[PDB]
Structure formats: C-alpha cells, structure tokens
Nucleic acid binder design. Structure first.
Ligand code: SF4
Ligand code: ZN
Length: 402
DNA sequence: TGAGACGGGGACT
DNA sequence: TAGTCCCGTCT
C-alpha cells in the first residue's frame, strides 16, 4: 500500500479538489480555438476530430505554438474525410516547423483509417481510441474521450505530473514505472465525474499558468489548501514516493523540490555539410535544389538542400559534398563553391552543426534533373515540407546574396 | 520493460 | 548573454 499523506483518503478532499479547481477554471480559462469548436459541434465525430488534432499538436509543444498551426490545419482539413484524402506531402507542409513530424503522418493515417474502415466514426472510449488510432497514446486517448465524449477518465501530462507530485508531495523519480502508476491512479481518482473533460483541462492549465515549473503562484492557487508541498513551507509522512536518501532536500527550492528533475545529458555533437545550389531559372527565379530525406529516422520524408554527414575532423571538407552535389546536377566547376558560415540546430538529442555552402550556376544543369530532386522558387521553398534547420540554411543563403 | 529516438521554441535566470 | 527546463508516442 501507500500512506494517506500520498493519497486522498478523505473523500471531502477529493470533492473540495474538484470544486476548487473547476471554480478557478470557470473564471480563468484561456480562450482557445479547439475549446470553442468542441462546445458548439454537436456531431460526436466532428467534435472528436477537432479535439484529436489539438491534442496531437499539443504533445511536447506549448499552447502558444499550436494555436496558429491548429487554425491552419482546421482551415485546410475541416473534416476527417478531408484529412483522409490529403497526401503525406501536404501534411508535412502544414506541419513544417512544428517538430516531431511523425505526429502529422499518424494523424493523417488515423483519420484515413476512421473514414475508410470505421465509416468515419470515431471510437468513443479511451481504450478503443488508443487501440485503433496510431499516434494516440494513453494521454491523447483519455484527452479525446473525456473532452469530446464525457468519459470519466483522468490524464497525466507534464503539467498534471508536476501538480500531482507537489499536491501529494511525491519526491521520487517521476519517470519510474511505479510512481507513474500512482500518478494515473491519483488522476483517475480526482477526475470530476460530472465534468471530466473540463477537469483534465483545468488541471493541465493549472500547471501551465499557476503551478509552473519555476516560481509557482500559490498566492493565486485554488488548490493550495490541498497541497502538501505548500503546507510544509508554512501532517507528515511515515518509503517509495518521498525523496530518496540520495535525493537532496533544499530549503530554498520551496515547493519546487517536487517533482525531482532528471539531469539530462547534453546532446551528442554531429556535423554536416549542406549546399544551396541555385540556377537563374526563368520567371520567378532563382531556383534552388531540394532533395528528399529517407522515409525513416530523423526528419523522415522532409525536403532539404543536399547534405552530407561528416566526422568532426572532416567538418570543413568539400570532397564528400561535391560528390553529393554531382549526383543531382552532374559535373560541377568546383571552385565556385562558396562558404557562407555555420548553422547550429539543436534537437532534443542531437547538436547538429551545418557548414553552409552556396553554389550559383549560370544556367540549367547539363544533366537532366533526376528523380528525387526538385528545383523550387524561393516562395515554393518557404511553403515546402522542410525542417526549420533548412529554413535557417536558406535565410543565410538569402543574406549572403547580392 | 524501458530508455533512447523524435523538433522546435517559449519562458525563466 | 547563453544557458536551462520543459511543453507524448513508439520501439
Ligand atoms: S500550492 Fe503551489 S505547489 Fe501546490 S499546486 Fe498550487 S502552485 Fe502548485
Ligand atoms: Zn513517502
């Protein structure tokens, strides 16, 4: 079992927690496009599709970044049938710059499955949503099911994890499988049976605007009377959920002692050489060369200027890049390769350093443009399915140009 | 099982 | 400044 200092053994505490959080939400909730669409869309499938898209985009992405992407998505594909007919290229174009591009592909595949195999009907429970929809894990299933279908299911995102680890003073490593089970148990216990969707959004919004990672706003916290972390700074525990013997306590960290942060290792340094090959084209030039990454691994299926991966001691070499550029353009006068500078793009796991080069041709390449290579205008590149790193490479190529 | 793969940026000091 | 933390799913 566990201690009651770590659970809500008093139903009055749960009832007060629901009413306090919901009351704060009822007078402070942020105006969001997917919240308006949900409360007015009477059709369950349409309503679930709007919630589905928002919850996928919100994965590891802040609300402020999602709002513009969600609006563009719903404008282009207002219905599941519209998304089901879209190409993966189009999805990658709209997802450009949002990050974690597998979310877009699976969102399109899932809608394609709903329309083509389920008659356009969304599963109505978190269990079946998670079972049938790719890219819909445990959070997104409970998110869709509670918000769109009123199923009484609690969810745990990063915000709820931070709120719960503080309210019940959980100081263990939150990523371990046992505290993860206890957090989802607390969420399923606390979720309001009458308003499960509004409860989950209230909990998540509380962790984004009040119970923030740094400098929380307890002077404005509605659940400050049910938080064990807050009362300590002003009932003690009897373990596996408190702070370990090696886990240090800090008087100057306040309630932010919880949750215990996991010191991440800095990303591995990788090095690459990329070049923006240009030709004058006709009207609307110049045209720049884009090639498509493999449909696996990092930035799968996106378009990029021709690049080569180099070991650190070779990061300034040209021979591998020239060999790559001659694949798509044929023979190339090599002394025209101009070094423009470097671009450092940070992934969650890779620190990539691009040595950016530029190559301006006088006319069209003598060899025919092989398949897999496209020559785009500048406007077409800015709307293409490319990663932000390549947009950084282009804007540098645009600066060092006359 | 679980620990790394998988993007980009917003908001703190 | 230039860091530092942090906003799920899958294999
Ligand atoms: S009292 Fe402080 S630590 Fe507790 S939930 Fe509210 S903001 Fe978070
Ligand atoms: Zn304990």
């Amino acid at each position: 079992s566990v201690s009651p200092y770590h659970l809500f053994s008093d139903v009055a505490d749960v009832t007060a927690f629901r009413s306090n959080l919901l009351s704060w939400y009822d007078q402070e909730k942020r105006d969001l496009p997917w919240r308006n669409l949900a409360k007015e869309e009477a059709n369950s499938d349409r309503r679930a599709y709007a919630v589905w898209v928002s919850e996928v985009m919100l994965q590891q992405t802040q609300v402020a970044t999602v709002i513009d992407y969600y609006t563009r998505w719903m404008q282009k594909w207002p219905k599941l049938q519209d998304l089901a007919s879209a190409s993966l290229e189009e999805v990658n174009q709209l997802w450009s710059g949002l990050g974690y591009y597998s979310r877009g592909r699976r969102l399109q595949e899932g809608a394609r499955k709903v329309v083509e195999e389920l008659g356009g009907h969304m599963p109505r429970t978190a269990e079946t949503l998670q079972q049938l929809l790719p890219g819909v894990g445990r959070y997104t299933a409970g998110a869709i099911a509670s918000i769109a279908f009123d199923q009484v299911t609690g969810v745990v995102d990063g915000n709820v994890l931070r709120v719960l680890c503080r309210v019940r003073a959980i100081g263990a490593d939150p990523t371990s499988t046992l505290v993860s089970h206890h957090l989802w148990n607390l969420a399923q216990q606390l979720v309001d049976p009458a308003r499960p969707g509004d409860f989950n959004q209230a909990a998540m919004e509380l962790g984004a605007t009040v119970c923030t990672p740094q400098r929380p706003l307890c002077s404005h916290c509605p659940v400050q009377s049910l938080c064990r972390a807050y009362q300590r700074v002003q009932e003690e525990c009897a373990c596996q959920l408190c702070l370990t013997s090696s886990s240090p306590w800090d008087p100057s960290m306040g309630v932010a002692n919880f949750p215990r942060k996991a010191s991440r290792r800095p990303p591995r340094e990788e090095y690459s050489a990329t070049c923006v090959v240009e030709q004058p084209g006709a009207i609307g030039g110049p045209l720049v060369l884009l090639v498509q990454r493999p449909d696996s691994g990092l930035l799968a299926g996106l378009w990029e200027f021709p690049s080569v991966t180099l070991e650190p001691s070779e990061q300034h070499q040209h021979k591998a890049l020239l060999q790559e550029l001659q694949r798509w353009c044929g023979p190339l006068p090599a002394i025209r390769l101009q070094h423009l500078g470097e671009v450092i793009h940070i992934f969650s796991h890779i620190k990539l350093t691009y040595q950016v080069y530029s190559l301006a041709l006088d006319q069209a390449p003598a060899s025919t443009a092989p398949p897999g290579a496209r020559w785009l205008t500048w406007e077409e590149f800015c709307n293409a399915a490319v990663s932000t790193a390549m947009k950084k490479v282009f804007r540098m190529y645009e600066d060092h140009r006359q």
